[PDB]
């Protein structure tokens, strides 16, 4: 915007990449309707939909933390930018990213928030049950003042 941050350095190799968003365990986002369901209870049949998948789920993606971990395992250097709560689950997620050698210096903690928890209120508009968000989870509550300008520079 106006100036730079920190101290200029030649920077190490491989070049750093930044993954921005929420850090979650699994949680494939892409969901559509499939016409070939298996038994609702017997999950031992559900592997048959892994080798005959819905087309939208042939190579599913996930949260940016998955991309960061995969990039580091492939020999690259990655940093994750996001916010987690100050509870046990947030520390567990940050530990998972740390053991994978993903840079967590861009991770902001929120002591008053519950990681991966969203407050919603249930309403019955036009005869159908619905929900609306009361308090967003800390993964959706990263502020522009909480960014890490060194990571964004490198």
């Amino acid at each position: 915007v106006d100036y730079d941050d920190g101290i200029d350095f030649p920077y190490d190799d491989p070049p750093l990449v930044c993954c921005f968003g929420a850090v979650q365990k699994e949680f494939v986002p892409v969901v559509r309707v499939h016409d070939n369901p298996m038994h609702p209870d017997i999950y031992s049949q559900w592997k048959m939909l892994q080798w005959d998948p819905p087309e939208f789920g042939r190579a599913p993606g996930g949260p940016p933390s998955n991309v960061a971990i995969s990039h580091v395992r492939l020999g690259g250097r990655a940093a994750f930018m996001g916010k987690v709560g100050g509870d046990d689950y947030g520390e567990e997620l940050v530990l998972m990213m740390n053991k994978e050698r993903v840079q967590t210096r861009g991770v902001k903690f929120d002591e008053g928030a519950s990681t991966a928890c969203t407050r919603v209120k249930i309403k019955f508009e036009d005869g159908k049950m619905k929900a609306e968000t009361v308090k967003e989870p800390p993964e959706d509550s990263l502020l522009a003042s909480e960014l890490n300008l060194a990571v964004l520079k490198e």
Partner: protein, 57 residues
């Protein structure tokens, strides 16, 4: 056994259950309605009334 390794005793388990369902009825039939030479006394079985009770031991 479409998606998992089946039980190693499933063939014995399913065979015996088939015998209880259809083997008994199919064999309790063909039992002749026993009649004497004089035809006076006729003995017969009502196969639809067949039952098995759980073992006492």
């Amino acid at each position: 056994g479409t998606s998992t390794i089946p039980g190693f005793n499933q063939i014995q388990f399913e065979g015996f259950y088939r015998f209880i369902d259809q083997g008994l009825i199919e064999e309790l039939s063909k039992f002749p309605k026993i009649e004497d030479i004089d035809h006076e006394i006729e003995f017969q079985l009502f196969v639809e009334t067949y039952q098995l009770v759980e073992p006492l031991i």
